[PDB]
């Protein structure tokens, strides 16, 4: 008839941090458009030059040169609308001069919304960016048809359905010339805001600790999984992604040996190294052949079937029991131990504390890495399993690959004694309704043996000559820890071309793990740091010492 109804898409929701600070907003602004025909018709000579000079005088950030250029490309006889020129001017920079532009009948000003992340680089891998709607995203969500913004990475991607909101509907009456005569009904679109667990103040501190370095970091509550901070480094500025990437922006994204475009936390995987010993050590204790105080002698190596497996301490550790084999990170103890225990036992135990398995985290496309096993080797390599492999695997090396997020889940679970799933989603504070919003993983015996593991972890950080004693032994929170190291085996012929000869050294220095938890007495937090190549101006332990010191300054242990 002449009753017609249109659909109104809502303003995409805002994203805040645990204490309310705004991480993704819709900046309000205006587009300036020019009346047509000012270069196509001889009558109006010099007309666009005039109204632009008044404009340039009003906002000098605008360049009258290029602006009249984009104009005459759109000024045509075939088109009779207004010719959009300025895409976006901030509301606050315009609303003084409003009435003068509105009442000017050569400039037409319309409101526009620009997605803006006020913290730029900070948290770029969690938050994410938005982008133009997808050809198959229109098949899935009809609200992106009307919007053309959809989440393309991060929370934005993961929680896109919640951030879209429901649409709104407006009914009106037309007539015989098709005109807005009477509005009939009108249900408005609604949108929701979400609050993450991160704290932007702590997120910032990580970024400046890591400034110049690379790697990953996670601060996570051990009781419920709430990620209080988490970074991949280096991070990128999000805002240039809403507007669109440049030809030049793509290069420095693809030819950069620090890989800032990649979420190392859950898309980067690395050899766990010595930090699996807590878990490998847990697999030992149910043998009757190994006990908390069984000793193996480390002469800096052992020999097996003609091949030599070294300890990292060429001059040998001596006799050690499990506690001190962890404390000093003796490889040789786990070599001997693993031989006793067998690979099946280590693998089974290692998979339950969360290796080679998604941590369950609410970011898109979490990688699982590689937890090696006889079954695994057989499909991936068409080769049987050799005691050599048990040995490499026992001390977190070989083909063993883990993501920083997995380490943190694992650390946390050792400290809690039970399941710990990491999450960023604190609450959904949808306008006029903030809505917010179990499998055992240790055996009954394995839980009885966990105090031994935790005492070893304490030693690593407070007893003289623990691999982390230098830095963690004088904190105002008693910390437990375990160190790890992953060496790099190869250096691609390309990556060499992308750097200069002097820096080759750095790019082959082994990686640094330090996972920790505090307070040893009543565990609350996990701090997992991974410095790519041991860092350029930070060190693993010093970073963790400072990350704990900042958390005390912010009362997160009060
Ligand atoms: Zn040793």
* Cα–chain center distance at 25: 19
Taking alpha carbons only, the member of 203, 212, 215, 229 closest to residue 259 is 215
Long-range contacts of range 331-335, CB-CB < 8 Å, 24 or more positions apart? 331/274, 331/298, 331/395, 332/296, 332/297, 332/298, 332/299, 332/300, 332/301, 332/302, 333/296, 333/298, 334/277, 334/280, 334/281, 334/394, 334/395, 335/302, 335/304, 335/309, 335/391, 335/394, 335/395
Strand, coil or helix: what is 120? coil
Task: Report the alpha-carbon distance of residue 370 to residue 169 in Å, rounded.
Answer: 50
Count of CB atoms within 10 A of residue 331's CB?
28
300 vs 290: CA distance, rounded Å: 21
DSSP state of 318: E
Smallest CA-to-CA distance from 74 within 61, 86, 83 is with 83
Q: Could you tell me whether strands 149-151 and 168-173 are parallel, antiparallel, or unpaired per DSSP bridges?
A: unpaired
What the block records as the tokens of 405 is: 């997020």
CA of 274 to the centre of ligand 1 (A): 11
State the Cα–Cα distance between residues 235 and 140, nearest whole angstrom.
Answer: 30
Query: Which listed residue (39, 124, 226, 274) is catalytic?
Result: 274
Distance, CA of 10 to CA of 42 (rounded, Å) = 44
526 C-alpha to ligand 1 centroid (Å): 27
**What is the rounded radius of gyration, in angstroms, for the C-alpha atoms of the chain?**
30
Cβ atoms of 254 and 248 closer than 8 Å: no
CA of 520 to the centre of ligand 1 (A): 26
Distance CA 537, CA 357 (A): 33
C-beta separation of 488 from 247 below 8 A: no
Q: Which structural technique was applied?
A: X-ray
Contacts of 5 (CB under 8 A, 6+ apart): 169, 170, 171, 172, 185
Contact 237, 124 (CB under 8 A): yes
- By the 10 Å C-beta count (0-12 exposed, 13-18 middle, 19+ buried), 156 is classed as buried
| Axis crossing angle, helix 450-462 with helix 277-284, rounded to the nearest 10 | 140
Q: How far is the CA of 507 from the centre of ligand 1 (A)?
A: 27
For 200-425+440-553, CATH gives 3.40.710.10
How far apart CA 498 and CA 504 sit, in angstroms, is 10
First to last CA, the chain: 67
DSSP-based three-state secondary structure for 156: helix
Ordered DSSP codes for 285-299: STTSS--TT-EEEES
Secondary element (H or E) of residue 335:
helix 331-341
**540-553 helix and 200-209 helix, angle to the nearest 10 degrees:** 150
Q: For 65, phi and psi rounded to 5 degrees?
A: -60, -70
Alpha-carbon span 169 to 9, nearest angstrom: 9
Residue 493 structure tokens: 């012929």
Distances from the Cα of 225 to the Cαs of 275, 327, 420, 421, in angstroms? 20, 27, 6, 5
Secondary structure of residue 364 in the 3-state scheme? coil
Lookup: tokens for 89: 């001017």
Calculate how far, in angstroms, residue 11's C-alpha sits from the geometric centre of ligand 1: 60
**Which pair of structure tokens corresponds to residue 202?**
């702590």
DSSP assignment, residue 401? B
> In sequence order, which residues have a C-beta less than 8 Å from that of residue 417 and are 6 or more positions away?
442, 447, 450
Strands (E), 375-473: 425-430, 433-434
Q: How far is the CA of 277 from the centre of ligand 1 (A)?
A: 12
In whole angstroms, what is the distance from residue 58 CA to residue 77 CA? 30
Phi, psi angles (nearest 5°) of residue 40:
-90, -25
Ligand 1 centroid to Cα of residue 317, in Å, is: 4
Tokens for 235, please give them.
Answer: 């991070």
Query: At which residue do the structure tokens 């997160």 appear?
Result: 556
| Other Cβ atoms closer than 10 A to 71 | 18
Tell me the residue ranges of DSSP E strands in 122-161: 130-132, 149-151
Backbone region of residue 320 per phi and psi (left: phi > 0; alpha: psi in -120 to 50; beta: other values)? beta
What is the stated resolution of the deposited model, in angstroms? 3.0
- φ/ψ of residue 433, rounded to 5: -170, 95
- Kind plus residue range of the DSSP H or E element containing 374: helix 374-381
E strands, 397-439, where? Answer: 425-430, 433-434
Which of 231, 226, 225 has its CA nearest to residue 205?
Answer: 231
> Nearest 5°: phi and psi at 295?
-115, 140
Q: What is the largest CA-CA distance in the chain?
A: 101
Helix axes 331-341, 343-352, angle to 10 degrees: 110
Query: Phi-psi region for residue 37, left (φ > 0), alpha (ψ -120 to 50) or beta?
Result: left
DSSP string for 33-99: EE-S-TTTSGGGTTHHHHHHHHHHHH-TTS-HHHHHHHHHHH--TT--S-EEEEEEEEHHHHGGGHH
The Cα-based distances of 485 to 331, 374, 503, 512 in angstroms read 12, 24, 20, 5
Residue partners of 386: CB distance under 8 A and separation at least 6: none
Query: Ligand 1 centroid vs 325 CA: distance in angstroms?
Result: 7
Residue in 159, 238, 165, 232 with CA at minimum distance from that of residue 196: 159
Residue 168 near residue 10 (C-beta atoms within 8 A): yes
* Burial of residue 195, with CB atoms counted within 10 A of its CB: 0-12 exposed, 13-18 middle, 19 or more buried: buried
Instruction: Please check whether residue 541 is in contact with residue 472, taking contact to mean a CB–CB distance below 8 angstroms.
Output: yes
DSSP 443-465: -HHHHHTHHHHHHHHHHHHHSTT
Please state the separation of Cα 256 from the chain's center in Å: 18
- DSSP structure class, residue 370: B
In 10 A of CB 280, how many CB atoms?
Answer: 26
Where is 528: in which H helix or E strand? strand 525-531
Contact criterion met (CB below 8 Å) for 206 and 214: no
Residue 548 gets which letter from DSSP?
H
The residue written with tokens 């003084």 in the block is: 96
Q: CA-CA distance, 408 to 519, in Å (whole number)?
A: 16
Rounded to 5 degrees, what are φ and ψ at 486?
-130, 120
Spatial distance between the Cα atoms of 556 and 558, rounded to a whole number of angstroms = 6
- Sign of the dihedral defined by the CA atoms of residues 376, 378, 381, 384, in that order: positive
Known active-site residue 329: no
Show the tokens assigned to 241.
């992604």
The CA 321 to ligand 1 mean position distance, Å, reads 11
Q: Where are the beta strands (DSSP E) in 234-386?
A: 295-298, 301-304, 307-310, 318-321
Question: Phi and psi dihedrals of 394, rounded to 5?
Answer: -55, -30
Query: If we measure between CA atoms, which residue out of 138, 128, 136, 137 comes closest to residue 158?
Result: 128
Distance (Å, whole) CA 188 – CA 168: 4
360 token code pair: 């369950």
Exposed e or buried b for every residue in 53-63, given b needs 16+ CB within 10 A? eebeeeeeebe
- The span from the CA of 344 to the CA of 518, in Å, is 32
Coil/strand/helix, residue 218: strand
Helix (H), strand (E) at residue 215 = strand 215-221
**Cα 299 to middle of ligand 1, angstroms:** 7
Give distance in angstroms: CA of 239 to centre of ligand 1.
50
Q: Please report the DSSP string for 490-509 in residue order.
A: ---HHHHHHS-GGGGTGGGS
Distances 12 to 45, 153, 430, 533 between C-alpha atoms, Å = 43, 15, 11, 40
């Amino acid at each position: 008839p002449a009753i017609k109804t249109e659909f109104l898409p809502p303003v995409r929701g805002q994203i805040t941090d645990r204490n309310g600070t705004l991480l993704a907003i819709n900046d309000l602004g205006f587009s300036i458009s020019i009346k047509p025909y000012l270069s196509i018709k001889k009558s109006n000579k010099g007309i666009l030059d005039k109204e632009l000079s008044e404009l340039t005088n009003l906002f000098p950030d605008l360049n009258a040169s290029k602006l009249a250029e984009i104009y005459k490309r759109n000024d045509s006889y075939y088109n009779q609308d207004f010719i959009k020129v300025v895409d976006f001017i901030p509301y606050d920079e315009i609303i003084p001069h409003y009435s003068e532009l509105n009442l000017n009948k050569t400039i037409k000003i319309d409101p526009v919304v620009k997605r803006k992340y006020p913290f730029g680089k900070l948290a770029s891998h969690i938050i994410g960016y938005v982008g133009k709607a997808n050809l198959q995203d229109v098949q899935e969500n009809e609200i992106a048809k009307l919007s053309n913004y959809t989440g393309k990475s991060g929370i934005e991607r993961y929680y896109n359905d919640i951030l879209q909101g429901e649409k709104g509907t407006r009914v009106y009456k037309v007539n015989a010339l098709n005109q807005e005569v009477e509005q009939l009904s009108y249900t408005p679109a609604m949108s929701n805001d979400i609050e993450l667990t991160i704290d932007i103040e702590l997120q910032s501190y990580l970024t400046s600790l890591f400034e110049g370095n690379a790697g990953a970091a996670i601060i996570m509550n051990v009781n419920d999984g709430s990620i209080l901070a988490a970074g991949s480094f280096p991070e990128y500025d999000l805002n240039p992604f809403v507007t669109g990437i440049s030809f030049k922006d793509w290069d420095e994204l693809s030819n950069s040996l620090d890989h800032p475009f990649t979420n190392k936390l859950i898309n980067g995987y690395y050899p766990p190294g010595s930090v699996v010993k807590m878990g490998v050590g847990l697999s030992f204790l149910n043998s009757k052949n190994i006990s908390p105080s069984t000793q193996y002698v480390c002469n800096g190596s052992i020999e097996l079937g003609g091949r030599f497996f070294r300890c990292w301490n060429r001059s040998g550790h001596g006799p050690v029991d499990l506690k001190h084999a962890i404390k000093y990170s003796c490889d040789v103890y786990f070599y001997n131990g693993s031989l006793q225990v067998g690979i099946d036992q280590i693998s089974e135990t290692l998979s339950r504390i969360g290796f080679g398995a998604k941590t369950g985290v609410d970011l898109p496309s979490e990688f699982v890495g590689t937890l090696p096993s006889k079954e695994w080797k057989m499909q991936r390599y068409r080769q049987s399993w050799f005691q050599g492999d048990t040995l490499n695997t026992a001390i977190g090396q070989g083909n063993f690959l883990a993501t920083p997020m997995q380490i943190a889940r694992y650390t946390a679970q050792i400290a809690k004694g039970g399941e710990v799933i990491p999450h960023f989603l604190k609450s959904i504070e949808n306008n006029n309704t903030t809505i917010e919003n179990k499998k055992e993983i240790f055996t009954l015996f394995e839980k009885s043996q966990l105090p031994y593991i935790r005492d070893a972890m304490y030693a690593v950080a407070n007893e003289q000559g623990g691999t982390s004693y230098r830095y963690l032994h004088n904190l105002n929170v008693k910390v437990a820890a375990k160190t790890g190291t992953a060496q790099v085996v190869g250096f691609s012929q390309t990556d060499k071309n992308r750097v200069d000869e002097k820096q080759f050294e750095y790019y082959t220095r082994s990686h640094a793990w330090l996972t920790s938890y505090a307070p040893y007495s009543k565990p609350k937090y996990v701090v997992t740091v991974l410095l790519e190549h041991g860092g350029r101006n930070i060190t693993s332990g010093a970073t963790v010492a400072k990350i704990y010191q900042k958390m005390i300054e912010l009362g997160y242990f009060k």
